[PDB]
Design an enzyme around this catalytic site. Structure first.
Site, PDB file in Angstrom:
ATOM      1  N   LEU A   1       0.821  -1.208   0.000  1.00  0.00           N
ATOM      2  CA  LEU A   1       0.000   0.000   0.000  1.00  0.00           C
ATOM      3  C   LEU A   1       0.864   1.271   0.000  1.00  0.00           C
ATOM      4  O   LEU A   1       0.748   2.105  -0.892  1.00  0.00           O
ATOM      5  CB  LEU A   1      -0.920   0.030   1.216  1.00  0.00           C
ATOM      6  CG  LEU A   1      -1.656   1.364   1.380  1.00  0.00           C
ATOM      7  CD1 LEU A   1      -2.650   1.540   0.234  1.00  0.00           C
ATOM      8  CD2 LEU A   1      -2.361   1.409   2.727  1.00  0.00           C
TER       9      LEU A   1
ATOM     10  N   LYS B   1      18.159   7.130  21.996  1.00  0.00           N
ATOM     11  CA  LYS B   1      17.805   6.071  22.924  1.00  0.00           C
ATOM     12  C   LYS B   1      18.810   4.932  22.973  1.00  0.00           C
ATOM     13  O   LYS B   1      18.761   4.097  23.877  1.00  0.00           O
ATOM     14  CB  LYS B   1      16.417   5.538  22.583  1.00  0.00           C
ATOM     15  CG  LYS B   1      15.333   6.566  22.791  1.00  0.00           C
ATOM     16  CD  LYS B   1      13.977   6.082  22.335  1.00  0.00           C
ATOM     17  CE  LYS B   1      12.892   7.099  22.685  1.00  0.00           C
ATOM     18  NZ  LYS B   1      13.206   8.472  22.205  1.00  0.00           N
TER      19      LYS B   1
END
Ligand SMILES: NC(=O)c1ccc[n+]([C@@H]2O[C@H](COP(=O)([O-])OP(=O)(O)OC[C@H]3O[C@@H](n4cnc5c(N)ncnc54)[C@H](OP(=O)(O)O)[C@@H]3O)[C@@H](O)[C@H]2O)c1
Lengths: 327, 329, 327, 329, 329, 327
Positions: free
Chosen positions: D43, D129
């Protein structure tokens, strides 16, 4: 014994394969016999000959673990006869022989345990005893694995035994039948690689029966060996067609002069019986087994320290005619 | 003046007995660009980088069972020594797939990788136990040898050569019996394990072999199985050595343990080619590019052997006085 | 507690490995202790030392899923101590460390569930807290996986907990023992990478016991942390052999100044106890657990918001002698 | 005049935030032969080929977890941008192997493949992170970075260069919070999620970063971890922005969510090399071919940093007025 | 004078019907360096090396499901003929993954391998059943064809060409019905299996096809699906042939067995290009390097077909008199 | 019917995915609905919209067998909607489509059996009937596999059925919605590939319901086909926005003029009902099934020999307005 049981045999489209399916079909109440193999042409041809609802054909390779697990669901007993047995070809395709025979044996062992099968009998060969060629080396590994499988102990117990016997008198691409197709098509000669070429001899039927009997004897872990006759290749060339000459050809790739059934260094682990032998395991199982009293209450005794079952040091010999009486 | 001049060498499992010695022998006697140690254990690898502290060394963590890793390992290598393996016979008997995964699949991957990287020469280590075997270990090793020899057919502009060096016990190797005979009479000498009174074994030195490899490496064509002529040592005598006098105990024949080791089969003699100090069992198959194994790449000529010959340890001619070993200990 | 149980420990041939096997052997009624590891030389040597029928040695790698499933059949409790712990080596062999530690932890988790094991304790490290080096990064992933495993809920429940403690005073290739082999072989000096190099210290025995106790406390999902003493590397070089000089050497590849046990950003998830701590999971399990009352009815309370258990901000410290009293 | 002249570029997961922008920025400002988008979803890939409708684009369906596919993907590529990943922290906490399979094994395959195809330069995207991490996501990313840097040792006539670009939050990126702060005050402004009052985060623009990559791509040697100097934005203020006045609600600290993001560790400062507008954390290991990271391939010189430095978001010098962000929205 | 001069050819599953004939036809009419037979069964392979006993032959044991093996197999090959497959329709219906593993994954590996070894031309064998299929077998074959055609996009200095030859039933092939019609009236002629009275099928000779391949091999560009114009033979008549008079029996439509085989779909005609004695269905996709399929590499020109055309067996123009087949038997 | 059951649906973040989750949520007592898919962004977005504890999101790929086995533990019913459905893309990424659809279907089938699921419904497509494009070829293989799965018979029985229906009126990247986004952004025209372009039409909701009903009917092995209306693409371009012109564009890669639901050569295997059809299996199961009486005691009869359900030879047709009434 066997009754309402399900039997799956790897390579059931082979010689031992059909001769065994036929015999189980006729002499037992095996509820369902399953043939597991790769070729669709043999299984299409084999379903039409064994036109019986007791059958069931699964197309699969032993090199495939998933498939085997699927194929073995609900099976009671399993006979392992799948394998690449052409010694010369194995020398040129060593990994192929290893994948099929060794990895194949391992996957079968695995799928059997997962499905809680009760008994498994793998087919060995005399070539696995003190081997020289690849084929035999892989087979010895297969026997080693199967014997060792008796140590696993899950919520389901499974016995793993091995049957080891010699050349099956006349089989898909052998000698005795070869020494006729020639004389038929005007054989110019009779090739004899050597005068000492001895070999244990047994029939498709004798083999198929020693197997079905082992299942009745086996405790799991044994390597049953039948006491079969030996035949000098010199006295065999005769029968087949003495008529034509015998142009010596030397030695094929990987052939021995004689074949061993029970190694000299195996003596200690041997136990003599009437018609057969047993080569007790080398390792110890969590749960000890007494290989002196079969599950048929047959008693066997050890053998002399210098014991060995060579194909030539044997005492039985197939008369240069007997093999024609068998043809 | 033959040498391994400016070359990168990688030895699998060179963190053990043979490896450490070969790694030492090559650094000392040859000028090879670098040497790669390929093994699984971090402890031994670290306790080796210190132990040697040599700039021409490189250490790679890795399992021979790992093909993608072996592929990166061998990248840039000229010669490969395959010494990685599970050799503890009785343990191999209890853990057969382990031994199989490492020794059989292991040999296959080292090959697959060596060819991919166009390695020049490869020598694989076999054992006397791979001759007319009966134990799993030896059976995987027979398979192993077959693979390396068969590996000589492959024909790409790589032209890798694969040979095998097969010999017996190594006088007191990484935890065996010689040291486990001292270790005992080296604590509470009053009980020594035994199996038979006819029990014999070939015995080579952890150094006689190492050099034999370097030598086999210099005279190979490819596809050979080099056999070093060594002395046989009947165990009984080997007893009074590592303990002049002690109450030995006849325990029992360990699983899959033979009684007389074979170096060359009786059914393969027609392939052997006797030499002054070694043997060469020619391929049981024919390659696209045939070779005359009667002429080492060192010119050494060779005559076949008696069509019946069976190089067995018991039927061995030479032996070792219970002092010739003391002159090893 | 543990009784007639079967225990399998990955990497049982290691330091924690034997010290644990020994202690379980001597202090419990563990019916069978299984060592699972790769080297035949250590297991051959380890079987002869622990000459006891309670043992059983399986040769296998944790990178192998089939084998583990086979090895864990019938096991009750599992201790996971297998791993590549050499920080520098892990920096040069990052995929090796990842395969063994991470994939290894995943396969162990899988095999345990399939075999319906009851309790699993994996060994972490302070290096997994706010890590910088690979080794620690992989270990943090291992802890994350093990904690998360408590969410699976098949026809069999399995508790997965983690034990995280510091440097084990003198171990296979460490410092304190290293700082003696030198003085023994005429150590020219005493290398001290830095003056602030602090480190939590615990013994092989203290570790082995905190583990066997966690099993008695654990609900599954906890990350038990013991309250152990800290020791300045400055006051350790002394003991070992003040005599010789101390040639500063800088900083190895991947070393921190101090090691963290419970991150500052973990405060909220922490619960203080007497001798130990607990770092409650970050995720919620289908079946909630009360990590305030161990399975030993021990009550624990939270910690101040600005809480953190650094190796230096610690209050306990091993006297420059105590480590000699332990040597 | 430095450029990516007539070159084939492939970006993994270029169907998302960073990707779409990088794909746009490169087509617009450089003349590269072609650009390959490598991602799993059909998609998004279809809604991108239309969205761009540019002939210099190519789209390949594929998972970074797939090595044979990546091998065909990268075939013929000069530069590779690894932006594929699972970054949803709390979800990564619940699905740890997923995050591991994609981020750790994923990085390994992209490398294995890049080297196989002799790619010239590779830049992998990390996160703040991955610095002294505590959540799984970040821990896989730390592993990831280590892999790409370690990848610089491999020495074949390929000589691929691997670098990493690590930066923080992207002002309103593919479903984050900035938009999820509008989206709310953009419907029923009466409840806004919060975690702490000290909760800070670095904030770069979805464009400041993209260009930073192209730039890091132009001044790399290989093995670096480029750190872009950015502004820190204490959350509280960030609140009145996407909603001048509304009844905010302090929900709770989501799983594995830190309180203060680190860009450069305190224990690694000795590796950093400060620059005018960026940082360079040098490898914690030594490569066969050393490099002077003090000199970008753009000549830019660099001096190290204070032996104690810890580039943290809270201890940041610059910040963002609750209007400087409005000037982003 | 076009030939396969001094070339190495490898045919997968050349141990069966098509294979044995193709192997014979090529040795007889062309001078190709060597020919490799790649198949699984040792019996058939051994009973073929004898059967042919030709030095220009080589036999490799192997499964198309095996990629590492195929990789070594194709090494050094110029042309590859993919004839390996599971074609027993009803059996494929009962063992769908088997058929899938061999026919779909099998085709993929042969491709992956062919490209790796830079093979020049590859022709894959399809079936009429892969046209608007309904049985599993045919559906795997449609997939198969798609793969080989799609394989023409890959662009490395290899430039391998992949084409497909799709035709119908082979007059009495390895265990089919023609022989199973003799075999019966060749024992106890009193019961002959039947399914329908409208049941038709295209029929080519085990030799007309073989040559068609060699021919398609000489006029290909790559990406084509060659269709040989053949005669249709309504079953009824085919009955009186292999048994002038016998009590036939209408058993039943075997699983997944169509009633009218399609050679060219009605929805794909716009892709076909009619030729004097054959057809060429052009790719349903566009390659980087377009080609004019209207010009065989033999100069043969071609005009498209009626925008509605549907080469079906029933709507076939030519047919076979119950004697034209006797002139085959 | 369904009650206190657990439902896992592969690709539950898709159109059918949510419309189905929603409907099961609202109309049943399904104890737990599990979404299994790959994207974290859709599942993060989908968890916040379906804010209900009945949910549970597992991130996983169908190309992953382990994960599926983990994900399906404890599931009762499984709906398989995962797949690559973009026909053109499948033509350029044929192995991707094969891996996902075929291998994906195989792994789902496997994981279901291992976990003893009770019922499985896979979603087919009219493109799988007498297919021409890859996408359809893979789907036909998927249907073949699922039907065949009904032959396995372990200690747990599992029914495998397939639901095959047409184009879902307006879906993620379709036509009718496309023919509006244009007119909205000033559509210069209305592209009509052809005047004969017919297509079966059904709604997201009609589909979701025929599925939940099949579960109530199914015996396992059926391929349920609903009787839905057809719509000429000529009379659809109108509705959407007759206003603008219709620049014919030819034929996309892999499109048919019309789509088939039940092949002509399938006639015999067909059984007509009221609202739906059933295409009985082609193979025979060890345990025969009577597909004439659903598990809802609905009786169905065969069809004429020359039967076929083409999209054009159909009798129902969606008025050029009805699709606007549905919009
Ligand atoms: N913006 C931030 O929050 C931020 C900050 C610092 C660093 N980063 C890093 O920058 C990178 C890109 O971030 P982003 O904001 O562009 O995220 P994003 O909008 O979620 O895009 C991630 C892309 O990765 C692809 N992907 C996911 N799994 C994949 C797989 N298994 N195989 C192949 N492709 C896969 C996805 O495509 P498909 O779903 O179609 O597969 C998606 O297009 C990430 O690696 C992230 O770690 C992000």
């Amino acid at each position: 014994m066997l009754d309402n049981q399900t039997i799956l045999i790897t390579g059931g489209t082979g010689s031992f394969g059909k001769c065994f399916v036929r015999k189980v079909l006729d002499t037992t109440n095996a509820k369902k016999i399953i043939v597991y193999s790769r070729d669709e042409l043999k299984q299409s041809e084999m379903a039409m000959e064994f036109n019986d609802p007791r059958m069931r054909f699964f197309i699969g390779d032993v090199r495939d673990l998933e498939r085997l697990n699927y194929a073995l669901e609900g099976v009671d007993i399993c006979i392992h006869a799948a394998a690449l047995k052409h010694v010369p070809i194995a020398e040129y395709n060593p990994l192929e022989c290893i994948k099929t025979n060794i990895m194949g044996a391992s996957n079968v062992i695995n799928a059997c345990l997962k499905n809680a099968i009760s008994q498994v009998i793998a087919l060995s060969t005399d070539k696995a005893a003190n081997p020289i060629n690849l084929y035999g080396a892989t087979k010895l590994c297969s026997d080693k694995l199967f014997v060792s499988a008796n140590n696993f102990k899950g919520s389901s117990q499974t016995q793993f035994s091995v049957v080891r016997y010699g050349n099956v008198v006349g089989s898909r691409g052998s000698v005795v039948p070869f020494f006729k197709k020639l004389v038929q098509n005007k054989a110019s000669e009779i090739p004899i690689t050597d005068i000492r070429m001895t070999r244990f001899w047994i029939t498709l039927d004798e083999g198929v029966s020693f197997v079905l009997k082992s299942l009745k004897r086996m405790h799991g872990g044994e390597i049953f060996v039948p006491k079969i006759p030996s035949m000098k290749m010199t006295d065999l060339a005769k029968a087949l067609a003495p008529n034509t000459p015998t142009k010596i050809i030397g030695i094929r790739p990987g052939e021995k002069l004689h074949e061993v059934m029970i190694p000299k260094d195996e003596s200690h682990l041997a136990l003599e019986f009437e018609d057969f032998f047993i080569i007790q395991p080398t390792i110890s199982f969590q749960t000890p087994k007494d290989y002196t009293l079969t599950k048929l209450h047959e008693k066997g005794q050890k053998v002399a320290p210098d014991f060995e079952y060579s194909s030539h040091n044997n005492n039985q010999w197939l008369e240069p005619d007997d093999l024609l009486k068998l043809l």
